[PDB]
Amino acid sequence: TKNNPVLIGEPGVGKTAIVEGLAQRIINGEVPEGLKGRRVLALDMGALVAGAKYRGEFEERLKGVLN
Amino acid sequence: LKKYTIDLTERAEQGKLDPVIGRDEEIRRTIQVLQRRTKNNPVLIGEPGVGKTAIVEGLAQRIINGEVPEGLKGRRVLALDMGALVAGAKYRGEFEERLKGVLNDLAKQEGNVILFIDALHTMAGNMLKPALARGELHCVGATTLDEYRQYIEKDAALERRFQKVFVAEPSVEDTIAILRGLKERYELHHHVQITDPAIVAAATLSHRYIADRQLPDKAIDLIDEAASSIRMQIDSKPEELDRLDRRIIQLKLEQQALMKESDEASKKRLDMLNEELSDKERQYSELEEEWKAEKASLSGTQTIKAELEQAKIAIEQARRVGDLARMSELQYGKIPELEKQLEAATQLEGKTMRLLRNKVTDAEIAEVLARWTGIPVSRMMESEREKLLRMEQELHHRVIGQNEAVDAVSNAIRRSRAGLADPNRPIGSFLFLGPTGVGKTELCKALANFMFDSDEAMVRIDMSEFMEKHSVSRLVGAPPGYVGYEEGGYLTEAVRRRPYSVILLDAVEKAHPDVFNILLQVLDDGRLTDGQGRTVDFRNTVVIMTSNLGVRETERKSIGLIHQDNSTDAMEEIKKIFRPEFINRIDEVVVFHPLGEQHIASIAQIQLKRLYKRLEERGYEIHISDEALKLLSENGYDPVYGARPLKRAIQQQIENPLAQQILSGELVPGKVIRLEVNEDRIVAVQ
Amino acid sequence: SFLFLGPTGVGKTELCKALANFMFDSDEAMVRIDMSEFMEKHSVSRLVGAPPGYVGYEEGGYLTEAV
Numbered sequence: 179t180k181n182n183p184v185l186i187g188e189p190g191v192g193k194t195a196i197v198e199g200l201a202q203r204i205i206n207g208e209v210p211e212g213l214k215g216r217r218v219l220a221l222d223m224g225a226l227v228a229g230a231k232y233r234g235e236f237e238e239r240l241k242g243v244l245n
Numbered sequence: 246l247k248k249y250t251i252d253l254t255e256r257a258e259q260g261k262l263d264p265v266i267g268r269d270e271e272i273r274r275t276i277q278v279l280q281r282r283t284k285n286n287p288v289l290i291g292e293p294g295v296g297k298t299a300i301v302e303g304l305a306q307r308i309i310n311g312e313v314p315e316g317l318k319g320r321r322v323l324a325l326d327m328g329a330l331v332a333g334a335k336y337r338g339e340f341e342e343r344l345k346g347v348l349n350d351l352a353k354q355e356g357n358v359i360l361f362i363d364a365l366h367t368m369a370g371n372m373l374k375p376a377l378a379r380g381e382l383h384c385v386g387a388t389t390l391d392e393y394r395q396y397i398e399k400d401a402a403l404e405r406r407f408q409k410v411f412v413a414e415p416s417v418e419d420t421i422a423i424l425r426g427l428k429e430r431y432e433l434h435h436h437v438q439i440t441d442p443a444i445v446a447a448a449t450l451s452h453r454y455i456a457d458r459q460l461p462d463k464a465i466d467l468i469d470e471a472a473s474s475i476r477m478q479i480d481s482k483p484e485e486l487d488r489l490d491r492r493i494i495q496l497k498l499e500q501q502a503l504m505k506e507s508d509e510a511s512k513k514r515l516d517m518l519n520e521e522l523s524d525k526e527r528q529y530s531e532l533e534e535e536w537k538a539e540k541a542s543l544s545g546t547q548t549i550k551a552e553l554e555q556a557k558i559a560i561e562q563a564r565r566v567g568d569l570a571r572m573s574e575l576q577y578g579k580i581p582e583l584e585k586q587l588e589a590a591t592q593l594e595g596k597t598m599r600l601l602r603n604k605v606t607d608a609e610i611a612e613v614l615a616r617w618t619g620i621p622v623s624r625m626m627e628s629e630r631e632k633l634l635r636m637e638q639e640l641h642h643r644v645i646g647q648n649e650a651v652d653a654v655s656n657a658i659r660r661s662r663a664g665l666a667d668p669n670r671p672i673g674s675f676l677f678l679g680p681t682g683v684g685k686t687e688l689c690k691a692l693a694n695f696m697f698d699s700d701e702a703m704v705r706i707d708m709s710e711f712m713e714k715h716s717v718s719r720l721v722g723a724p725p726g727y728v729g730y731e732e733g734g735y736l737t738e739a740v741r742r743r744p745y746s747v748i749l750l751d752a753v754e755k756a757h758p759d760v761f762n763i764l765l766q767v768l769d770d771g772r773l774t775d776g777q778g779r780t781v782d783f784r785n786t787v788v789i790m791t792s793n794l795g796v797r798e799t800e801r802k803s804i805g806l807i808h809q810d811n812s813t814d815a816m817e818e819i820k821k822i823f824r825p826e827f828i829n830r831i832d833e834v835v836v837f838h839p840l841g842e843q844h845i846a847s848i849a850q851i852q853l854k855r856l857y858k859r860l861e862e863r864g865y866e867i868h869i870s871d872e873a874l875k876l877l878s879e880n881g882y883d884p885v886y887g888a889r890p891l892k893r894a895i896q897q898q899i900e901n902p903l904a905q906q907i908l909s910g911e912l913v914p915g916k917v918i919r920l921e922v923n924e925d926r927i928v929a930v931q
Numbered sequence: 932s933f934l935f936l937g938p939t940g941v942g943k944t945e946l947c948k949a950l951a952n953f954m955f956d957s958d959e960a961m962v963r964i965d966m967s968e969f970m971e972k973h974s975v976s977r978l979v980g981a982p983p984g985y986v987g988y989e990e991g992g993y994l995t996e997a998v
């Protein structure tokens with residue numbers, strides 16, 4: 179538990195690039211075991227915030243991707 | 246129906262949930278709310294991570310154990326899904342159709358299911374306040390104190406309907422009992438061993454230092470991190486394996502370049518590389534095979550741990566069915582054999598475990614806590630031993646003389662890393678008095694480059710900014726509702742980012758007496774609140790005050806002023822505001838002293854070096870005579886003014902003609918300059 | 932409701948933690964408030980809370996929430 183980390187710093191210090199070179203180490207297979215084959219995807223907003231003018235739409239999008 | 250049906254009783258019943266430990270009175274209180282007929286609906290009040298959801302779950306564990314009283318037997322608990330409620334409400338009213346259908350099978354379920362709702366702020370409600378007001382439903386709430394503020398306080402209808410449950414933050418030894426409860430779960434899922442001083446030290450250090458989060462959950466995540474980490478070091482490839490893997494793979498790429506011959510009679514002389522190849526295949530293959538056998542050993546002990554838990558699952562189901570054959574079988578049955586070959590396996594891991602480690606202990610917790618804040622325990626011996634033993638040497642690289650102060654600060658750091666400090670105190674609080682001449686903040690930067698390896702992290706603050714009333718609104722932040730409130734003061738911000746640092750204070754005569762007394766809340770107790778609403782720790786952070794109360798008078802009163810008398814006329818300005826709470830609650834009152842002339846020679850030859858860096862920037866070198874350096878010695882000296890005419894006497898005497906001859910294009914790179922003295926003004930010569 | 936006047940090194944804060952350690956069995960349950968921060972006008976808005984329409988009006992001061 180507490181599976182999810184936080185990166186804190188200034189911008190440009192390389193936080194997104196730390197995620198990048200991590201994923202590079204994964205596809206190089208230089209990761210420790212268990213994570214070999216596990217996939218990394220980035221979720222954005224903006225595909226999320228599409229046409230939910232009425233209530234319950236966006237919520238059901240997020241619930242669907244949670245399932 | 247089933248879209249909103251979420252039972253916990255089956256989740257404890259399938260063993261998916263975790264034990265609760267030592268919680269009686271609040272569960273008692275909750276049952277006592279449950280038997281009410283109106284306003285029969287409890288709300289959990291507690292801090293984050295104090296364990297509210299766990300209290301509900303372990304209550305359901307007491308249900309499925311049948312330990313609950315006879316009013317509660319047969320009853321069920323459904324946690325609510327707000328996220329399914331919001332899912333699908335296309336047009337107006339379909340939501341309340343779902344909600345009234347929930348109200349109707351609540352009706353025909355007839356007091357059988359006690360409802361649980363977490364995230365109480367999310368909850369509509371207009372059709373709930375009547376069913377509340379009768380008590381026709383029986384629901385359980387759980388929420389936070391500030392959701393209690395912003396949320397329920399504004400509705401008078403809810404506060405008639407609900408009850409407060411003060412889930413207090415549990416104590417240390419209590420938490421140790423909890424970790425004795427959960428240590429089987431994390432030893433199973435994390436495949437390793439856990440000793441008990443790891444647990445006790447986890448409660449002690451976690452409660453001591455990390456002041457942002459709460460018990461128990463911080464120490465829980467500590468154990469999750471350490472056990473995950475040792476599982477990583479097991480599952481990763483070991484260090485003889487990977488260092489020898491680098492050496493063999495360099496020998497395979499070098500072998501790949503050496504078997505490829507340009508002249509076979511010349512390049513295939515390589516016999517030495519290939520016998521070293523077979524040698525490192527022997528060493529690599531043997532440590533490889535030992536690593537394989539040890540991994541097989543840990544596989545076997547993980548199988549016996551797993552089937553042990555299988556026996557625990559079957560004996561708990563045997564408590565349900567009451568099978569006298571299964572209960573007597575598993576009491577007297579597998580687990581005596583599992584204990585025999587288990588303990589024989591752990592002794593066998595007494596023998597075979599050379600390369601890897603399994604049993605997580607205190608030093609691992611020290612490294613983990615270091616990888617949050619920055620202070621280890623065990624590691625500092627091996628690397629840090631060297632600059633610890635050479636600390637006074639190291640400060641005598643950049644800072645000459647005043648060996649009293651060097652010994653003072655070095656003793657303070659030794660008390661810090663040693664474990665000698667009072668925990669309710671900061672580490673170091675030093676005042677620097679007497680004359681100057683000496684580089685007091687230069688010594689501070691020597692510490693900044695010492696432990697933090699740069700002068701950046703040493704946060705410096707002037708006091709001569711801070712003579713005003715409004716100065717406090719600079720450094721600590723603003724009161725509520727006003728300009729500058731949600732931004733805070735950068736002192737509490739910087740300490741609250743990186744906890745354990747070195748704070749520089751300067752020229753302290755010019756400050757304000759409140760800042761002196763805010764500072765009195767610093768030196769006492771090492772903590773300080775802000776305007777924003779919380780406190781900030783200081784108790785492993787050194788404050789340093791360079792001041793001038795001495796050099797305001799000592800370079801004037803150079804005859805007869807002693808350390809006690811300097812404390813007296815120090816206590817002219819000092820004695821009013823600074824009291825024996827202040828003056829006793831500073832650590833050491835370091836006085837300084839004027840300079841020897843050989844010291845000034847040392848400072849001069851220090852100042853040469855960065856000028857030689859300026860020369861290696863451009864490809865040059867200065868030679869000097871001893872006698873021209875002696876001229877800089879006899880020019881730089883001033884008794885009142887200390888060594889300090891040195892550098893400007895230097896670059897004013899020598900760098901101006903140097904800049905003329907360089908900017909002329911006269912002086913060619915690749916050459917050597919000697920400081921000759923064509924006459925008593927020093928001249929630089931190619 | 933007490934006033935303690937007297938010297939230094941007398942154990943005033945020790946007396947306070949002695950009492951809090953007596954009843955409430957800790958020195959953390961004791962609520963500590965400086966008065967030497969509070970030389971300005973704004974301090975009543977600090978320990979009490981802000982007037983309406985504002986941010987600390989939504990939070991509230993220390994002593995109010997604590998008691």
Ligand SMILES: Nc1ncnc2c1ncn2[C@@H]1O[C@H](COP(=O)(O)OP(=O)(O)OP(O)(O)=S)[C@@H](O)[C@H]1O
Pocket residue numbers: 187188189190191192193194195196
């Ligand atoms: N160590 C590094 N190696 C290579 N590129 C780096 C490194 N650090 C920073 N960069 C570059 O700096 C860019 C910005 O840093 P980021 O990876 O985005 O992390 P960041 O500090 O969060 O910056 P943001 O995204 O603006 S907040 C990266 O996209 C890289 O191009």
Ligand SMILES: Nc1ncnc2c1ncn2[C@@H]1O[C@H](COP(=O)(O)OP(=O)(O)OP(O)(O)=S)[C@@H](O)[C@H]1O
Pocket residue numbers: 263264265266268291292293294295296297298299300423461462
């Ligand atoms: N006595 C305990 N026994 C077992 N687990 C506990 C105990 N106390 C706290 N926990 C853990 O504390 C974690 C967080 O507490 P919760 O039960 O979720 O409610 P909480 O205290 O409000 O914290 P949240 O979830 O952040 S709101 C749970 O996941 C439990 O595993």
Ligand SMILES: Nc1ncnc2c1ncn2[C@@H]1O[C@H](COP(=O)(O)OP(=O)(O)OP(O)(O)=S)[C@@H](O)[C@H]1O
Pocket residue numbers: 643644645681682683684685686687688752791792848888
């Ligand atoms: N004895 C000394 N040894 C080494 N450097 C010195 C010495 N005396 C002065 N300096 C230099 O003098 C410069 C400034 O010294 P400071 O550290 O500011 O002295 P100070 O007592 O802190 O003065 P302030 O900041 O006005 S209180 C730096 O370049 C130091 O290297």
Ligand SMILES: Nc1ncnc2c1ncn2[C@@H]1O[C@H](COP(=O)(O)OP(=O)(O)OP(O)(O)=S)[C@@H](O)[C@H]1O
Pocket residue numbers: 826938939940941942943944945946
């Ligand atoms: N009688 C005592 N017993 C134990 N410790 C004492 C005693 N008197 C003084 N001390 C120590 O001196 C420190 C200062 O005492 P305080 O309890 O703060 O009362 P104080 O001397 O009046 O200082 P204040 O409270 O700021 S006025 C305490 O934290 C103890 O470390």
